[PDB]
Structure 1
Amino acid sequence: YHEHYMRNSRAIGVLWAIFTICFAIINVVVFIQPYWVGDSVSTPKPGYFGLFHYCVGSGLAGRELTCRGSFTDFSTIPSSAFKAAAFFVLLSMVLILGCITCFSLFFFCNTATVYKICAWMQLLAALCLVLGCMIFPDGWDAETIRDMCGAKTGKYSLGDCSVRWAYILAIIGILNALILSFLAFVLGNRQTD
């Protein structure tokens, strides 16, 4: 019985780490790729935008997507809500990367202790991602986003635009972070036996 116990624990820990790396990739992708919201057929003017970066069409029956925005320079971010959301998503990415670094502690530190460490860090990353996703719609009142989507757009109001893959992928990342955190807690309590 004990050998099966240890084998299942080891394998499930390996899968947990694999999915942790996958969630870190997801967090990096959503943080970088600017496809959180996008135009629609009824939108006055095309483009897309993410946490900080935004590309907007010139509006002459072509693309000419002029692009502007960078987390390094906070001046060009449209709104304070966007700045807060970008900072929270960055903090979540740093936290999950810290857990992937803390995987190195398995040589020396006790397995339960490091499992609880990454459990808490993944939970904190999930909380940060939740706050980022809840705060990001608050900045839709910005003049750039309103000029893009239209006058009907507003605070926590999608309007004419449509959410693109990055937003739903961030929500999926939130769910993944919660389940991975609980998984890490259960594994840490399970190694103790």
Structure 2
Amino acid sequence: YHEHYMRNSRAIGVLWAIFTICFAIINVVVFIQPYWVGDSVSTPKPGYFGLFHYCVGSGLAGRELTCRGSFTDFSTIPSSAFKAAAFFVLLSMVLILGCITCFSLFFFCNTATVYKICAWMQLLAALCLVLGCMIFPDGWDAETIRDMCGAKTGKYSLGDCSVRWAYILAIIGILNALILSFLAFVLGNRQTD
């Protein structure tokens, strides 16, 4: 029974680590790719925009996407809400990557303590992604986003634009982060048994 217990704990810890790496990949992808919100059929102009980077069409029945924005240059970010959301998603990235690093502590540190430490960072990572995803719609009333989507668009209102794959992927990241945290906490309190 005890050997089955140890095998199950070891295997599920490996699976946790794999899913944590997957969530880190997800966090990097949603932070980088500018596909949070995008145009629709009724939109005045085409394009997309993420946390800081935004591409918009010129409007001549072609693609001609001019792109602007960069986290390294906060002046180009359309809104302070966008800046805050980008900062929070970065913080989540820093925390999840810091966990992956702490995995290294399993050699020496107490397994239970490591699980728990990695777990708390994974919880905060979830908290900061939550704050970022809640604050990001606040900046939709910016002049650039209004010129893109339409006059209907505003604070916490899509208007005519539609959410693209990165935004729902970030919501999935929030869920995966809170969930992963728990599996860790229990993984820890269990290891002690």
RMSD over aligned CA atoms reads 0.3
CA distance in 1, matches of 2:78, 2:41: 24
Displacement of 1:44:
0.5
What SS does structure 1 have at the residue aligned with 2:105? helix
Displacement of 1:97:
0.1
* 2:188 maps to 1:188: yes
> How many residue pairs end up in the alignment?
193
Displacement of 1:114:
0.3
Superimposed CA distance per residue, residues 22-53 of structure 1 (whole angstroms, 9 cap, x where no aligned partner): 00000000000000000000001000000000
For structure 2, the 5+ residue unaligned runs are none
Displacement of 1:143:
0.2
CA distance in 2, matches of 1:35, 1:59: 19
CA distance in 1, matches of 2:188, 2:74: 40
Displacement of 1:174:
0.2
Paired-residue identity, %: 100
What SS does structure 1 have at the residue aligned with 2:14? helix
Q: What residue is the counterpart of 1:14 in the other structure?
A: 14
Displacement of 1:106:
0.4
TM-score, normalised via structure 1 length: 1.00
CA distance in 2, matches of 1:159, 1:17: 40
- List structure 1 segments (4+ residues) > 3 angstroms apart after TM superposition: none
CA distance in 1, matches of 2:176, 2:29: 14
Q: What residue is the counterpart of 2:56 in the other structure?
A: 56
Displacement of 1:175:
0.2
Q: What residue is the counterpart of 1:132 in the other structure?
A: 132
